[PDB]
Amino acid sequence: GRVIRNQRKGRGSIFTANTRLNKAPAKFRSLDYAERHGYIRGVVKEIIHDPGRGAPLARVVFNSPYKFKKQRETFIANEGMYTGQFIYAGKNAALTVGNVLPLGSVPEGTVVSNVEEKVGDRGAIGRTSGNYVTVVGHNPEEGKTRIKLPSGAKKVVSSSARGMIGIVAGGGRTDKPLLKASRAKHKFAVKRNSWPKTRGVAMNPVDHPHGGGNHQHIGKASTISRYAAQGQKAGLIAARRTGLL
RNA sequence: UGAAGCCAGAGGAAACUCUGGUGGAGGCUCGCAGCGGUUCUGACGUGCAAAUCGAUCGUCAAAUCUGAGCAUGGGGGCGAA
RNA sequence: UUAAUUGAACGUGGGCAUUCGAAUGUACCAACACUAGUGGGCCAUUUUUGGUAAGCAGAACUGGCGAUGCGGGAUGAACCG
RNA sequence: GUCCCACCCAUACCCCGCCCUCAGGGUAGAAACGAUGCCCUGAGGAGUAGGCGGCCGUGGAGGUCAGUGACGAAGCCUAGGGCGUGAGCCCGGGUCGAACGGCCUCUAGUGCAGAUCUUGGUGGUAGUAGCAAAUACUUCAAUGAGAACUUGAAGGACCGAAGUGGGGAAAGGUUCCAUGUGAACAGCGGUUGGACAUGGGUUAGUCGAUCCUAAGCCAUAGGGAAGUUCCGUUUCAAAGGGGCAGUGCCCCGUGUGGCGAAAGGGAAGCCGGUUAACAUUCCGGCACCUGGAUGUGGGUUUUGCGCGGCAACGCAACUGAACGCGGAGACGACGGCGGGGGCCCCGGGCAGAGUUCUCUUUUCUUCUUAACGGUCUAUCACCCUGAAAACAGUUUGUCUGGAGAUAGGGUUUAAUGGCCGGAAGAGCCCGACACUUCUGUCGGGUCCGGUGCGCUCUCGACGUCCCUUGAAAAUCCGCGGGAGGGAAUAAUUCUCACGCCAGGUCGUACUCAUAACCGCAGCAGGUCUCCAAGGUGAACAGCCUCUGGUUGAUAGAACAAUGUAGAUAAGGGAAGUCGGCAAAAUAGAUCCGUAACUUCGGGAAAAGGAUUGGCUCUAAGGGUUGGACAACCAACUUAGAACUGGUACGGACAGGGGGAAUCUGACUGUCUAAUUAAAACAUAGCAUUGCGAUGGCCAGAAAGUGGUGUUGACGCAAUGUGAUUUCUGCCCAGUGCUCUGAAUGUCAAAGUGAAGAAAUUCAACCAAGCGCGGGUAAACGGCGGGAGUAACUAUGACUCUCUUAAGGUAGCCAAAUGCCUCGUCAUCUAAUUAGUGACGCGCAUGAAUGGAUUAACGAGAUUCCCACUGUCCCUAUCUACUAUCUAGCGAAACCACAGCCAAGGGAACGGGCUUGGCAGAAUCAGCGGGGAAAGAAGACCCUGUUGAGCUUGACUCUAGUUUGACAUUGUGAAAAUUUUUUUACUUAUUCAAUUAAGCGGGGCUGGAUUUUCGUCCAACUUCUGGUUUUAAGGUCCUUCGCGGGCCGACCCGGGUUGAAGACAUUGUCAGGUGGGGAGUUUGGCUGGGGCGGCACAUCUGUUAAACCAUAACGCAGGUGUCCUAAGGGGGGCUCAUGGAGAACAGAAAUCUCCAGUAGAACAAAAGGGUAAAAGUCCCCUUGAUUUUGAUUUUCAGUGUGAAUACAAACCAUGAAAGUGUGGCCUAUCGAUCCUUUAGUCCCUCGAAAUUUGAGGCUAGAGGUGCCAGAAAAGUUACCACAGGGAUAACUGGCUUGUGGCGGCCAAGCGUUCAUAGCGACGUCGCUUUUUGAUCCUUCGAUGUCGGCUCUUCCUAUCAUACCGAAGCAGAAUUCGGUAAGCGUUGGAUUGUUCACCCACUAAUAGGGAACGUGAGCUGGGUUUAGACCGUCGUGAGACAGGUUAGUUUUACCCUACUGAUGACCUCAUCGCAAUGGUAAUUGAGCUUAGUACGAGAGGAACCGCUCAUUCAGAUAAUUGGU
């Protein structure tokens, strides 16, 4: 046969992300002396919409402690933030919504967002609309914190990893039906070229593992081994189980 | 054609319910150009034309149409298939 | 080989002559080398198998057409001369 | 039928002549000869494939002819001649002008009729097809040889502003303009031209490019790659940019390139005039921007950098360094509203033109004001006073207001607004005179209002939509900051006015299309955009007109058929047809009325009605200024009423047919460009799967490489189903996926141990995988039989049994899924294989391979009803353009030669042959029977040791991935020098962050800590949308300076900071996985192939026709084994059976006698053979051994298998003769290579020797059953090539089982009676309208069903004519004879042939003509490609299973036919008639007659009239149509 559709996606050139309207990426400011021992204060100048994301962004302005300049930086806004709010980031920052604190200085049971797996990786976990990370417990003997991820998985990260108190803004987005092929089309038009999807079972054998036959059907099981050879993975890859839950 | 929102009046004990306006929403509707190409299985079929012409027809505020610049190159691309 | 110079096989020396042991013909002496084309066949008298039968399918002997004209069967690849 | 005479003629026979071939003789003291000759004799003569011999011809080479030739070589033409059997040679005549030939050898690119041969040229067709879309031209004159398509004037028309107009972008390139023109081109002409020839033509500081960046591309640093080069665009880089006087000295630095838009961003030009061709470009006037210099005036300043206002802010200036902050550039779509420019519209006035029988103070035209410099206003908004409920202000739209509204007073962004300048001096319009041209002069004027849901552009404030929020950069400006500098006698802002200089380079013409672009072209196609008048009208709808532009497309004459386009038709109204295909009908606006169903939104324009013109009126709906008023303006909309008319009025144009249902998809949307627009795809909704970044999915040869990702589970990635409602059942055995392994199995390389001299071997251990075990079906998928049973019968709630992983649950159904099947019942109709509603043991329905139901929607499929109609009964008529004739111009396909038939034979359907019929020049218009007409080396089928696409558990591999080992790979500790395990370290390696900014240790400050002095933690910043920078100061020096050092700001270590860490990673091997990918294969025979079978290696009998040989998918069978005896020898005996007899005992037990030719046995099929044996029992043995030869059968006299007779050993047996080299004989089986064994006291390892190891020679075994021996799965309905009529599917040909039809006999039936009418059991035929059988023709194609239309033929006669017979009284009916003259229907269902009904009828007979008839139609079916379902398959896919959508080409050629002319015999009129054609048909009323006949019922016919059905010819008084 020929190269199937999911194989062509890795080359790009029509499958790359559309990012003309996307300005500077959403991430914390680089860890520095001010945040490691103390705190620094910033002002939420304005809350903006970032195409293809679904959660609003907030541009916060800080003061450079060395150069007499204002460092612009785009965070991910939480439910409650507003323009003119003062944002405090550091070890000694107060525990309020929108403040950026190390996870080791935050009590168990809290709710944080934009958690970083590694110290300095400026934001990795809990960044979509209604998602958040819960601090399960501490372990100060070696400086490690046990968190719970939006997927329901527990994980242990460094107690020096940062995070923003609260819940990401825009929650409940996926609770409204799109109702229209347009609404799906406009949703993906600013993200990438992945809509619509033709069904593989409706293709020809040259095009897909499912194609062909005098009836539209899958000849073999839709469950595909974990180590299939890059062109066989056209189903439920490495399914521990199938069927209705 | 007439969705939210808004104005006035009426009925009821209340819950609330009616009437007349205003408003101008919708991958709404008739329909011209554009776009397409259902039927006549019409014309032509050494044609005007290596796919056109006539009537009839589908859509017509949008998943509509479109120019230029750019990208994807052959067991490769691209495909609402 | 035999009981055996008894046999078996092959011979020397003699005898039988061209009537040398039926007819007819010899208008086919024998051997060798190298090589071509061919390796779809078909028809008929007689015999004969399968089949209801076939201008059907398959065999035996012989003769023909293929490769072949000529006179006859008006006409015809095979019939008659 | 037979007999007898004579005669005719074949290439045969006889004689003779001649040619050639073959054979046999003669020919030298040569007077003797192309001796390769001559003379004599005899016989013979066909020929494809093929073989051989001799000769002829062509281009060249050597020799020779003392060769020919300008007094004419070669070539060419020549119904002139000679020679040869022939290929050929020679000569004469004509043309021509320079070379050529014979003979002997040598040599070769050496001989053409074909190859759908190649190249070039030329025909018939043929003066033929044709030059027919876009409404259309006519008169006069000039030019000219010539005028329909040149020009001027006049008339008539068209485009009708989304144009046939005026400009451009792309593209083209001189097509632009003038002058001239022979040919060619402009498919007719041409004086004309986008043609040809010669010249000319494009002027920019202001337009565009140039500048910026976007998507993206390419350098640099680096890293890969054998390399061409790939990645990389800010990285793991010592990257750059400015100041002061070719160098010196300073300051900053986070970061350091280019290309990429003539539509994006952007400094700045307008008006008038001017050329044959340019204009925002030239000329005149009047401006603007940028850059650089620099003067005057003005402004500021003698305590140095302006004043005014409460404020919003203002003014002509009014310092401002580094650094920083902000704005502009800079942004979506849509809606109504308001302002402005332009256009349109309505008045009045000044001028001009048109009309003027009459009328119209009338109809039409001009009445203009640019950039730029000011000045005065224009929405929002903001400021001051003040403080609101009785809430107020306020928009078309409901927003604002104690966060300050109303009100009053102000500030300000915004001009395409008014006024002034520009500027009337311009332009324009009139009138009067100049003039030879130069085109000259003069005068007057160039005005004032209104209206609007008007159109277009633009601006502004609001509003709506988004899980959609709708570019960036160059560049410019403002502010914060306060560096430096700056006068009191002159400096200074050169953000004020004026003054000075300069603005480089390239493009610039023209078309922008029914003739300048692309399509082979001057092609009805395609190609981006701006401006957009009047009327009607809702309207850039259609129709007509103005400005502007065309009048270009071969023309003239007639008006035949058939056409194409436009139409109309009486009565009926789908009866036509597969089907209402096509057409008709409805249609605007206002008022009324509107159902089921429903997701409550719709359906809905449901359905269905009424009105509509003109004229005269009336009323309502406003604005402005002055206090329920008065006066002056305004243009549209609505409503009411009289009158009126041939009751007509959306009068043209424009403009929905509707309803009741079924199947299917929810809807909007999309695709097979050029046969399928769909039920297919998509979609929202639902569900499942993977993944927490050292990750998931994917790319790359590799990479310090990349996409998702400027991403982080409400995300990305992979799938299935397909809105809503209601549900989504059971099964984990099979195949997949997944999880754990404690586990015992299998188990690679490396490593370990043992043996050995070593190579090497062996053993243990042994990762992943497999195996084992669990889960998983919204994973792939699957979801049963048999029997009995209820008080009529029937059925089976119930029971029994086999069996599965589970046995189909809820639902649904002859459904797009049901064969039987046209299922059964009901409804629909007169009639229904159609539709609908039910039923259900459902071949083969069924639940996200989704089940059921669904409102709305559908160029989807289907049925019915109403309306409507030429679909039809049944045709007719009209118009335009063709066809037709003419002038001009002028092809192509096709073509062996050609063109009359009947029959015969023939390769089985002839134009040619044979026998007949016949047959008379040359033609024109039609036509579609034939030329098995043309188009294409059949696309169906088969063959090929020909492919390709796709699939998979085919064979062989492979990228990738997983696991193990070794290297990278280092340093310690702990237990059990080194083993395995754990643990620790950083420097290798890896990852991340950052402008490498603050790390580790200590000190200082504080508190609880034991207060051990000596322990742990902190150490500036948290009511607010402000600011933070170019250090203040302390101390020491100093030129006494915002000068210099240290501190301010603790010391030390130079590890930038974290994570991971000898594990990842990387390199090399090894095991697994791996249709993701690659290569290849997928036997043969065969009454076509596939399925079936094995007739593929072999044996017996028969076919087989008396030696042997001999075929078929002929007949009846067999083999792939079995046996230490069932082999070998010897001896004794006789078997199967029958009779008779003996206790249990009998039909069968064992014993005895007699008879018993084999009727038994001999392993196994059958056939031979055998009796003191070849059978049976007993005794002894291994001849079933060794050595090679000869022979036989199949046969090539090869192999294999098998067999025969000897010879030489060693044996066995017997007293011996003898016999024994497997089985009584005919079947019982296997090469090369490789491996292994036995033997060879053997040979070799090639520098020498020994021992292992290896290789040799002779003989076996391991096996090829496709058996003389390849290692091998499918599908193609997406398909391809070489071929085949060696071979199927359709016609024809032979045959006739089968189908159909007809005879003979006579058992019976018929009241009795074989034969009125039938006729069983038998039996003989005929036809080719059924289907078979066969495979002769056609595979470089004969268009393959039916229907429609039309002609003709047959008889085996349904009706009609005339007759015979009857179980014929009449009537009706049945059988038969002549006879094919003449008829044999309209419909429902089905594509149907057929069938089955309704109805009429004299009757509703059967057939043929290539299953008549596709250059006659249609395309319903069949019969490609799309799609759905059921069953089957793991899958790709298959299905004479069911559905839906799917391009039907060419006549002008010859003949045939239909008509029409026509030469010759002088012209003409009037006639004859050979021959050819021939045409009529049937029924009903009255009378006969209620009569004959007959017991009633019933019930005729002949004659004679009167009409009507079908058919035929003609006609236009009447009616109807046109």
Ligand SMILES: C[C@@H]1C[C@@H]([C@H](O)CC2CC(=O)NC(=O)C2)C(=O)[C@@H](C)C1
């Ligand atoms: C089947 C097995 C193998 C066979 C033999 O090795 C086959 C060879 C044949 C030869 O021609 N070359 C081929 O490549 C393989 C042998 O004879 C059999 C007994 C046993």
Ligand SMILES: [Mg+2]
């Ligand atoms: Mg498909």
Ligand SMILES: [Mg+2]
């Ligand atoms: Mg595949």
Ligand SMILES: [Mg+2]
């Ligand atoms: Mg399909």
Ligand SMILES: [Mg+2]
């Ligand atoms: Mg349209």
Ligand SMILES: [Mg+2]
């Ligand atoms: Mg069309």
Ligand SMILES: [Mg+2]
């Ligand atoms: Mg057509």
Ligand SMILES: [Mg+2]
């Ligand atoms: Mg034609």
Ligand SMILES: [Mg+2]
């Ligand atoms: Mg575009």
Ligand SMILES: [Mg+2]
């Ligand atoms: Mg041979």
Ligand SMILES: [Mg+2]
């Ligand atoms: Mg032959």
Ligand SMILES: [Mg+2]
């Ligand atoms: Mg002969």
Ligand SMILES: [Mg+2]
């Ligand atoms: Mg002789």
Ligand SMILES: [Mg+2]
């Ligand atoms: Mg001559």
Ligand SMILES: [Mg+2]
């Ligand atoms: Mg000369």
Ligand SMILES: [Mg+2]
């Ligand atoms: Mg040659």
